Design a protein around this ligand. Structure first.
Ligand SMILES: C=C1/C(=C\C=C2/CCC[C@]3(C)[C@@H]([C@H](C)CCCC(C)(C)O)CC[C@@H]23)[C@@H](O)[C@@H](O)C[C@@H]1O
Ligand SMILES: C=C1/C(=C\C=C2/CCC[C@]3(C)[C@@H]([C@H](C)CCCC(C)(C)O)CC[C@@H]23)[C@@H](O)[C@@H](O)C[C@@H]1O
Lengths: 10, 240, 240, 10
């Protein structure tokens, strides 16, 4: 979950 | 009677972070699904908000100390505060004359009736517009505007945060900067800090009302299918 | 030596369903995120494919007997066959002269290099273009084109289907119609049915290669975030 | 799961 958020948060 | 080097360094970092993540030319907006005036504005406003979430994430990553929080807390703060930061940062495009958000183009001018065509009601849009006008009337320095966005982001009283003490200490230092900045650098700002903290309360109320109305969109698949994956994630109810 | 009333009724229903779900004016395409020529074409092609999935669902719901399958089988057939129906139905916009898909506008003209700018490689695009040219060279009657899409959709040899016997019986009746139509109504079509069944095999191979390359997009969140919720659902790996 | 597909399939 929060796949995109984790990516954007680097 | 004077700001310290550490206080000024915080202001410089936050101003730079905002200038890096807010593009006054609005030229990227041509890449969104076009506006249409059935929820004819939902595709364009979904894309606008999704774009804006990415900018808020970029702004947050440059707030001193945010990057050092746990990943779960960083997500918790962004999921609860994203809509508030977007409402705050949109004031930079708001016009008291037009009573609308103006983004360098007539197709990218957003009035209240546009947002009704994305599934929202006057119960949200009337307080939202009154919020924008009151915030615009404060005539905040960009220093104060970016401090307020950072203070709003680093609020510990948000669902899901674990390290309340760490986030409160970060928010405390930002509040100290803002109070000192207003006192030294803002002529006649005796009542300003209190007004700015009031706006943070107003945003909480807009956040609640937006979440309620967003549940209706996300519960109807013909509307939720118009959203973006990022919007679905950030405004969704998943818990890490 | 002649088609029956039930065979003709099937053809009429399938032609009507295709005319209702394929708009030759392509005027809806202005609503997609615009094309850009970093995967600059992925937003526009995601929107095109998402739009096309909705049309394929609408076409499927009007195939005799599809509506009466279980919901799980209807989803199983659509998830496995959607990309194939889209490749098949796109032949109606393909030009042998331009070697490209042309949709009533230069911005909505798609060549091979456009699709490379959405994350795909020549390992998919070379067989895809050769498929389009060979299919166009068959000069199918619209009757034969819609029968082939329906036959492709109602294939029982797809992962996840439970009622193999029901779907095969539907596909059997459609194959009988197509064979009879070619024999009676298609001058010089002695070898046509065999060629059309070959194209169904080619589509299986394109399906596999597309699924492999789509996994790369969906495993990279900076790319999967550009997709639509419907695309994520239909091309995803969830099992009902 | 398949929230949108279920909706579109009526
Ligand atoms: C986003 C930004 C800008 C305007 C903001 C606006 C004006 C349009 C309506 C908006 C998005 C409100 C809606 C209630 C949101 C609903 C979302 C969903 C349909 C998913 O429920 C909230 C803020 C509002 C730009 O002009 C520019 O300033 C950049 C800034 O980031
Ligand atoms: C969709 C339709 C049309 C063209 C189709 C095309 C041309 C562009 C490239 C396309 C989408 C291929 C890509 C491999 C798909 C990748 C998708 C993803 C990036 C998610 O992996 C497959 C078919 C191809 C229109 O011209 C018109 O005929 C309507 C028709 O429905």
């Amino acid at each position: 979950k929060h796949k995109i958020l984790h990516r954007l948060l680097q | 009677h004077m700001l310290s080097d550490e206080q000024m360094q915080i202001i410089n970092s936050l101003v730079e972070a905002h200038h890096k993540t807010y593009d006054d030319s609005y030229s990227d907006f041509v890449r969104f699904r076009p506006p249409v005036r059935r929820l004819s504005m939902l595709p364009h406003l979904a894309d606008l908000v999704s774009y804006s979430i990415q900018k808020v994430i970029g702004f947050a990553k440059m707030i001193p100390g945010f990057r050092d929080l746990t990943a779960e807390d960083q997500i918790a703060l962004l999921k609860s505060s994203a809509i508030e930061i977007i409402m705050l940062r949109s004031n930079q495009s708001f016009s008291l004359e037009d009573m609308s958000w103006s983004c360098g183009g007539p197709d990218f001018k957003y009035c209240i009736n546009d947002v009704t065509k994305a599934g929202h009601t006057l119960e949200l849009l009337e307080p939202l517009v009154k919020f924008q006008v009151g915030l615009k009337k404060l005539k905040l320095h960009e220093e104060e505007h970016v401090l307020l966005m950072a203070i709003c982001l680093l609020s510990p009283d948000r669902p899901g945060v674990q390290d309340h003490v760490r986030i409160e200490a970060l928010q405390d230092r930002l509040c100290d900067v803002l109070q000192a900045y207003i006192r030294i650098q803002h002529p006649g700002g005796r009542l300003l800090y209190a007004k700015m903290i009031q706006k943070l309360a107003d945003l909480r109320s807009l956040n609640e009302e937006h979440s309620k109305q967003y549940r209706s969109l996300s519960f109807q698949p013909e509307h939720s299918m118009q959203l973006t994956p990022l919007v679905l994630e950030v405004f969704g109810s998943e818990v890490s």
